[PDB]
Amino acid sequence: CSNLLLQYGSFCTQLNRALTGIAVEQDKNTQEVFAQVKQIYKTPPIKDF
Amino acid sequence: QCVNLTTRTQLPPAYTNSFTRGVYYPDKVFRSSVLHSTQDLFLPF
Ligand SMILES: *[C@@H]1O[C@H](CO)[C@@H](O)[C@H](O)[C@H]1NC(C)=O
């Protein structure tokens, strides 16, 4: 069946490319939402607000 | 009639590495500037 499927490598490459694009897009979404600032501030030890 | 050789100095069989050898045309068709995939009996690299 794999030997018969070899002639559909274009289709399967297209599918894998689409899914890879989706995955990279998800990583990009998370980064652009949360990593707005690249200075990791830490809260002061004392709580006087 | 046929004669069998008697003088022999034999060693264990020797080995070497075949790298990127043994590739042959799988068809009598002319293709130019194409990345073509195939499956057949091939010598592994
Ligand atoms: C070679 O010698 C004879 C023929 O001349 C033959 O019968 C024999 O089997 C051969 N020797 C070996 C070791 O195979």
UniProtKB/Swiss-Prot annotation, chain A:
Residue span relative to the full protein: 749 to 797 of 1273
Designated name of the protein: Spike protein S2
Function: Precursor of the fusion protein processed in the biosynthesis of the S protein and the formation of virus particle. Mediates fusion of the virion and cellular membranes by functioning as a class I viral fusion protein. Contains two viral fusion peptides that are unmasked after cleavage. The S2/S2' cleavage occurs during virus entry at the cell membrane by host TMPRSS2 or during endocytosis by host CSTL.
Organism: Severe acute respiratory syndrome coronavirus 2 (2019-nCoV)
Superkingdom of origin: Viruses
Outcome recorded upon mutating residue 16 to K: In strain: Omicron/BA.1, Omicron/BA.2, Omicron/BA.2.12.1, Omicron/BA.2.75, Omicron/BA.4, Omicron/BA.5, Omicron/BQ.1.1, Omicron/XBB.1.5, Omicron/EG.5.1
Gene: S
